[PDB]
Design a protein around this ligand. Sequence first.
Ligand SMILES: Nc1nc2c(ncn2[C@@H]2O[C@H](COP(=O)(O)OP(=O)(O)OP(=O)(O)O)[C@@H](O)[C@H]2O)c(=O)[nH]1
Ligand SMILES: [Mg+2]
Length: 664
Amino acid sequence: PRRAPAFPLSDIKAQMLFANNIKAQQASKRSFKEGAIETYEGLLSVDPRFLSFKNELSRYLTDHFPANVDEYGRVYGNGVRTNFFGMRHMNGFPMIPATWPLASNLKKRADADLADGPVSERDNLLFRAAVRLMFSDLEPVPLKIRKGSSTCIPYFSNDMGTKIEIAERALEKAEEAGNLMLQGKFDDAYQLHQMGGAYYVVYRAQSTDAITLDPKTGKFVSKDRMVADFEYAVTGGEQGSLFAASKDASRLKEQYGIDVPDGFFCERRRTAMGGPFALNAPIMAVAQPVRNKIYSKYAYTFHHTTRLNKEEKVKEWSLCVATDVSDHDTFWPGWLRDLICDELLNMGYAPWWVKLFETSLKLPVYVGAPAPEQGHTLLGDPSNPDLEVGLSSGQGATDLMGTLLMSITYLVMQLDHTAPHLNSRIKDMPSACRFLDSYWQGHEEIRQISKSDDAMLGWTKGRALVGGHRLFEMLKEGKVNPSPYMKISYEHGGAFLGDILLYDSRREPGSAIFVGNINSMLNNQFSPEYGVQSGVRDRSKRKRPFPGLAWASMKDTYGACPIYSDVLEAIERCWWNAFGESYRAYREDMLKRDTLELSRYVASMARQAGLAELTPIDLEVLADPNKLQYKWTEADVSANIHEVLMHGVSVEKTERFLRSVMPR
Ligand SMILES: Nc1nc2c(ncn2[C@@H]2O[C@H](COP(=O)(O)OP(=O)(O)OP(=O)(O)O)[C@@H](O)[C@H]2O)c(=O)[nH]1
Ligand SMILES: [Mg+2]
């Protein structure tokens, strides 16, 4: 029932994705690679002392700090939600094979009993109202670019100067490209302006994943991760197979001479997609202004910073429901892309821009290396973009596409199961906008705090409260999906954007507090996703620019966890046993070295200026800028720090571009 076309690297369609330069040619051909990450300078993830440390620590902490999660998934007591065995992976060595990305998610959605469009007129008005509220009265801002990020297809440049030139040229030629696409001239738009082609698939590590200890055998068991073979991916699951990837690490001894202790596994690998930068630049020029609007006007629902910022909102609720979405990106509906595009057109957005936006969400995908002897295949024909992959991770507005889908999905759930008395407030477009604008500001008796697939749903006192409790009960039972749009359940140990909601004996939001997740501190410190990249001279271009700095923000981030001191002492004791060294002293030296190095990058910082002016967010972001992609935003970071990590295209060029896109 319609298989996606697939082309080998040798085919002209795939060759046209890679420019005649070394980096682009190497990206096309790069074979499956694996190896121990440099966890910290001079320390490999597979160092026997380090693995001994992880074995002792994971065992000790699980033993002394068992999970304290009630029947309703509320975390209490010690603030622990699971075992500490997630650290037991051979970081840098992936599970084999990684998945082939599904070319079409239509069958996947239909088989999961999810809708192929808005179910009712109300829902149609609410999704359209979300577009109207989000894309409205936008103010131009400079187009900010992450330092060291790739331009991907076709140039594969990491040079800031080249990236600035590409973005400026893209804003100049986006109209001409979009008009070519409106005429079905995708090849011309790509050939002339590099707008089109495909997403470049890279496989990224999820460094920690579920591991359990079988009491009967005393053997560890890793969580099975289902992967699609090539046949399954091109047929949207009609043919081929979906099977468990192998996390068995025994192979490392034979292949690499690495001693593998018992109960240590290969890492979970996730697909990540890099977009063609010339196509993303015009999209990002609108996406950043949208973020600024939603994080300002709709800050209640959308702008999340500290544990206290979150706590102030939640404390006022009579009921707090922490939801979970199954595989958000792969289930994300193409009908939403079409609805968004249709509404933008109705608002008066430039048709050429809407076509670029639509095209970015139908684009083919170039598969690199999921396993040895596999990959190097283009899925979909770039001459006529028609894929249904769900949400591509490298699309210029992915966060906004997930936020738009989910914010409405949760409101619909609250309407359907708890507040039918509010349905009369949604009669047409003006009333749908008025209602949504009030709801997003936290002015209704039904509330939410969300970001993409993470949310907390609230009820104050009122008519909807009783329904709220029935919905929570329905979730606990887990027999009926409460949504026609996505697979929704409750989170087993409710947390929001990394902070655990710690309840007391009362099990009420009013007396509950947000605390940092101690397990995330452990994940970040002992299982980083990337190595230190010691060979990359420019630290601002590394995946972990200043790792040592995280020690300075630790107490601020994690200090409120009931077991904070206990964990730090357990670390010290175990590190002493494994290395014969003080972990605290080791981290204090790393903090000193990184603080000194940082002044080289900050113009306001003198040769030995300390971290006095820096916030804990600034420090966490400098140690892990990936937190800027899922946890925080540009506005949450000090201005002098933002400039270390990003560079921008002038507001003059974006202002002129934006004027041509927008209705008014
Ligand atoms: N802990 C962690 N998660 C990440 C990171 N980068 C991306 N994620 C994503 O966050 C999700 C993992 O959830 P968890 O490890 O259980 O905890 P969390 O996302 O950090 O926070 P909560 O969902 O509020 O519980 C996946 O969808 C990941 O792809 C990272 O650096 N650290
Ligand atoms: Mg959650």
